[PDB]
Design an enzyme around this catalytic site. Structure first.
Site, mmCIF file in Angstrom:
data_model
loop_
_atom_site.group_PDB
_atom_site.id
_atom_site.type_symbol
_atom_site.label_atom_id
_atom_site.label_comp_id
_atom_site.label_asym_id
_atom_site.label_seq_id
_atom_site.Cartn_x
_atom_site.Cartn_y
_atom_site.Cartn_z
ATOM 1 N N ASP A 1 0.809 -1.225 0.000
ATOM 2 C CA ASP A 1 0.000 0.000 0.000
ATOM 3 C C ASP A 1 0.838 1.270 0.000
ATOM 4 O O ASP A 1 1.631 1.497 0.912
ATOM 5 C CB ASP A 1 -0.912 0.059 1.215
ATOM 6 C CG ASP A 1 -2.137 -0.792 1.071
ATOM 7 O OD1 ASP A 1 -2.095 -1.820 0.360
ATOM 8 O OD2 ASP A 1 -3.162 -0.385 1.652
ATOM 9 N N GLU B 1 -12.381 -0.801 0.146
ATOM 10 C CA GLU B 1 -11.221 -0.312 0.892
ATOM 11 C C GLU B 1 -10.620 0.966 0.311
ATOM 12 O O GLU B 1 -10.964 1.379 -0.796
ATOM 13 C CB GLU B 1 -10.137 -1.390 0.943
ATOM 14 C CG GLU B 1 -10.664 -2.821 0.933
ATOM 15 C CD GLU B 1 -9.569 -3.854 1.155
ATOM 16 O OE1 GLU B 1 -8.652 -3.959 0.310
ATOM 17 O OE2 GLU B 1 -9.626 -4.564 2.181
HETATM 18 O O1 LIG Z 1 -4.413 -9.914 4.293
HETATM 19 C C1 LIG Z 1 -4.966 -10.570 3.147
HETATM 20 C C2 LIG Z 1 -4.556 -9.803 1.898
HETATM 21 O O2 LIG Z 1 -4.203 -10.695 0.838
HETATM 22 C C3 LIG Z 1 -3.703 -10.028 -0.327
HETATM 23 O O3 LIG Z 1 -2.489 -9.337 -0.014
HETATM 24 C C4 LIG Z 1 -4.722 -9.023 -0.850
HETATM 25 O O4 LIG Z 1 -4.172 -8.303 -1.958
HETATM 26 C C5 LIG Z 1 -5.103 -8.065 0.268
HETATM 27 O O5 LIG Z 1 -6.053 -7.110 -0.191
HETATM 28 C C6 LIG Z 1 -5.666 -8.883 1.421
HETATM 29 O O6 LIG Z 1 -6.115 -8.045 2.489
HETATM 30 O O1 LIG Z 2 -2.358 -4.646 5.346
HETATM 31 C C1 LIG Z 2 -3.073 -4.432 4.126
HETATM 32 C C2 LIG Z 2 -4.546 -4.207 4.444
HETATM 33 O O2 LIG Z 2 -4.873 -2.893 3.994
HETATM 34 C C3 LIG Z 2 -5.664 -2.975 2.810
HETATM 35 O O3 LIG Z 2 -4.824 -3.007 1.657
HETATM 36 C C4 LIG Z 2 -6.692 -1.852 2.760
HETATM 37 O O4 LIG Z 2 -7.481 -1.896 3.949
HETATM 38 C C5 LIG Z 2 -6.322 -4.336 2.813
HETATM 39 O O5 LIG Z 2 -6.314 -4.841 1.477
HETATM 40 C C6 LIG Z 2 -5.483 -5.185 3.746
HETATM 41 O O6 LIG Z 2 -6.308 -5.867 4.695
#
Ligand SMILES: OC[C@H]1O[C@H](O)[C@H](O)[C@@H](O)[C@@H]1O
Ligand SMILES: OC[C@H]1O[C@](O)(CO)[C@@H](O)[C@@H]1O
EC number: 2.4.1.10
Length: 411
Positions: A43, A284
């Protein structure tokens, strides 16, 4: 506040088309480069102002990332015969998510600035996603972010950016202020749902209102599975599509809060802007683009968080309105703005649409042969989309991790 939420309906979802070339990301080349051999990022939260513009400071572009260490040499992450298991490592990362920052004069080729908060400053060990806001021409920054486990709490931490001629460092970021949690009347709580969603603050000052607001991901309040699907949530579905399966368990929404004043110290929870009951559980990283007097609300979601008898790709979805509190219309008629191609459905995630039309992503999983994939943990090629009424068009591509600033501030 006398407004009603806009429902993202099953009828809307049925319009979602995978592999639309105007709405599909280019295929990630499996020989992609990585921005760090020491850490994973995913992210990416570019530094911006309350209006949503990406800001550079003294000629330095700045991004914040969810970050974790590559356990290349740690025995805990070893394969049979003692080999480094890059996959198990990568997939365990969310538990050790920490927020770090990077800097560059070019928006490209990022330099690692390291950790924003010293270990132990965040009330929860997990530092999950949010938004860094530039408050000042003195360099003060409010980092809004999410504290997860125990619970899920939106919080902020003040600090300060100090730039040199060849480097950038941070000061402060020593005390976290918890702002609010799920209430239970409007947004869903842990009590009501062990899998409840609550995260991702994106603050903004409204141009028409002058007031300070924030979007965030939430779930519609109520015990899990108690939501029922009325004809509102259904939408105007075609004949033969009345079967919803376990849709009752999907209750995603984009939440809204407003501050008492622009300091952003106290927040009044408000009704959601977008609800996806019976459609998708996860909306999200909500975020706005303000363009042509309109409100462009983007939010990312998953193929596999869609309700039964519904499907869409991983990517960013979007809604447009003439006013902050709606009514909103789904972008491209279905809501899909930028989706992964079906051949590489999980190549990228966490698409962040910036007001200059540039969309950034991190590379997750790129397929090679059969069941094996290459994992990334690095920025994807930045794409540009063109916004036009309630339609989007992908328009061209730039280099890996290209996140230029729209505006420069001198301190
Ligand atoms: O924690 C589980 C995660 O798996 C993968 O990384 C997905 O891209 C993410 O969106 C999700 O929250
Ligand atoms: O740690 C990554 C977390 O944050 C997000 O990208 C946005 O909330 C989710 O896809 C995941 O649970």
């Amino acid at each position: 506040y006398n407004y009603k939420p806009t429902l993202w309906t099953r009828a809307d979802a049925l319009k979602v088309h995978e592999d639309d070339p105007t709405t599909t990301q280019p295929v990630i080349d499996i020989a992609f480069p990585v921005m760090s051999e020491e850490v994973f990022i995913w992210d990416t939260m570019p530094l911006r102002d309350f209006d949503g513009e990406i800001i550079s400071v003294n000629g330095w572009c700045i991004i914040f990332t969810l970050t974790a260490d590559r356990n290349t040499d740690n025995p805990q992450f070893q394969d049979e015969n003692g080999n480094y298991d890059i996959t198990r490592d990568w997939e365990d990362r969310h538990g050790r998510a920490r927020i770090c920052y990077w800097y560059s004069r070019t928006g490209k080729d990022w330099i690692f600035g390291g950790r924003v908060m010293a270990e132990g400053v965040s009330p929860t060990t997990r530092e999950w996603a949010g938004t860094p806001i530039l408050l000042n021409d003195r360099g003060d920054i409010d980092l809004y972010y999410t504290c997860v486990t125990p619970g899920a709490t939106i919080a902020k931490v003040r600090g300060k950016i100090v730039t040199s001629d060849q480097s950038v460092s941070l000061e402060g970021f020593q005390q976290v202020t918890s702002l609010f949690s799920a209430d239970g009347t409007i947004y869903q709580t842990e009590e009501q749902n062990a899998f409840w969603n609550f995260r991702d603050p994106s603050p903004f000052i409204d141009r028409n209102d002058g007031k300070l607001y924030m979007l965030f991901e939430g779930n519609v309040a109520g015990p899990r599975g108690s939501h029922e699907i009325t004809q509102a949530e259904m939408g105007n579905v075609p004949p033969g599509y009345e079967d919803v399966g376990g849709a009752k368990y999907q209750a995603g929404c984009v939440g809204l809060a407003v501050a008492k004043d622009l300091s952003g110290s106290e927040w009044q929870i408000l009704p959601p802007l977008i609800t996806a009951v019976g459609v998708n559980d996860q909306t999200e990283r909500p975020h706005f683009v303000f363009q042509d007097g309109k409100y462009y609300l983007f939010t990312i979601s998953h193929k596999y968080t869609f309700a039964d008898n519904l499907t869409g790709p991983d990517g960013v979805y979007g809604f447009v309105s003439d006013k902050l509190t709606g009514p909103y219309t789904p972008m491209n008629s279905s809501g899909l703005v930028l989706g992964n191609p079906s051949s590489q459905p999980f190549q990228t995630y966490s698409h962040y649409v910036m007001p200059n039309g540039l969309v950034t992503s991190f590379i997750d999983s790129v397929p090679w042969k059969g069941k094996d994939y290459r994992i990334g943990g690095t920025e994807a090629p930045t794409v540009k989309i063109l916004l036009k009424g309630d339609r989007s068009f992908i328009v061209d591509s730039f280099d890996y991790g290209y996140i230029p600033a729209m505006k420069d501030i001198t301190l």
